[PDB]
Amino acid sequence: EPKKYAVTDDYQLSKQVLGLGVNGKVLECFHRRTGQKCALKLLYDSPKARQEVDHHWQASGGPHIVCILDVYENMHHGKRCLLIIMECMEGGELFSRIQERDQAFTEREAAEIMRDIGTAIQFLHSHNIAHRDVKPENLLYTSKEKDAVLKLTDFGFAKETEKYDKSCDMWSLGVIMYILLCGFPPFGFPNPEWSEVSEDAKQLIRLLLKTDPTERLTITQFMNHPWINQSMVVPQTPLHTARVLQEDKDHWDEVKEEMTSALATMRVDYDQV
Ligand SMILES: O=C1NCCc2[nH]c(-c3ccnc(-c4cnc5ccccc5c4)c3)cc21
């Protein structure tokens, strides 16, 4: 299953960094014989690294999941490492693409995005995998083109399960959906940004952002909600999202940082009350 020969036999590596995960850095690379641009995640070997490889491998091929192409077990700097070769997500991050629109971003488009993310979580939860770190850095597009596909990645905190772990994914969906609809995170629905958002959308968010994890919707309830299930019928209402993301771009790193912190807090064995 994992290739034991040198990854450089098959791939020409670059030093262009494409992203950073808890277990390793993500580099650009090129398949030596097809020329296809790909992404290489370098994981120094460990049980956590073996878990990530195992979980991403099982999830690879599922809807809206970044696909693994190859996995290599190599020696690097005298250390045993695992190299995950993934499809190159040349469209970049979800919210950067929205930010780079001027053009109308509609509530229907947010509903289609959320349905895509929910489809990925639905696949994972039906295979007893909870992601536990769904966040802007992990939501990527296959290309900069209009027909790009949104996919989830990074299984470094994934866990084979537990209703609590799955409810942390559902909380992530509510946070992402909140930002999708107004351009700032929930950490009420203030006017003017939320003035014209439908009642279905605000109802779904409140059901996902319950403080009590047992009160949060499951992914099945999420996918059956009319805002998701009937996402095509969702009003084409133009949102403030792109404009707000541009206006607040200097604070975007802080938004990502506190979401990362909130997600890590949900993963601790024992937390304060
Ligand atoms: O596992 C991860 N944890 C943290 C972030 C991340 N990005 C990736 C990743 C994977 C594949 N392609 C990319 C990628 C992202 N952004 C790009 C922008 C422009 C060109 C290529 C890009 C590739 C990123 C994986 C991970």
What does this structure look like?
- This protein has helices spanning 47-59, 94-99, 107-126, 163-182, 199-208, 219-224, 226-229, 241-247, 252-267; strands at residues 11-21, 24-31, 37-44, 68-76, 79-87, 92-93, 129-130, 139-141, 150-152, 159-160.
- With 273 residues, the protein is of the alpha+beta class.
- It has 2 domains: 7-88, no CATH class; 89-273, no CATH class.
- The strands form 3 sheets. The protein has a 5-stranded antiparallel sheet, covered by helices on one side. The chain has a 3-stranded antiparallel sheet with strand order 6-8-9.
- The radius of gyration is 19 Å and the shape is globular.
- Residues 18-21, 26, 39, 41, 66, 86, 88-90, 92, 137, 140, 153-154 line the site of the ligand O=C1NCCc2[nH]c(-c3ccnc(-c4cnc5ccccc5c4)c3)cc21.
- One of its GO terms (biological process) is MAPK cascade.
Radius of gyration, in Å, reads 19 Å
Which strand order spans the largest sheet, edge to edge or round the barrel? 1-2-3-5-4
- Decide which structural class fits the backbone: alpha+beta
What is the percent of helical residues?
25-40%
Number of strands: 10
Bound molecules: the ligand O=C1NCCc2[nH]c(-c3ccnc(-c4cnc5ccccc5c4)c3)cc21
Shape: globular
Q: Sketch the major β-sheet.
A: 5 strands, antiparallel
Element order, helices and strands?
EEEHEEEHHEEEEHHHHHH
EC number: 2.7.11.1
Family: Belongs to the protein kinase superfamily. CAMK Ser/Thr protein kinase family.
Protein name: MAP kinase-activated protein kinase 3
Main location: nucleus
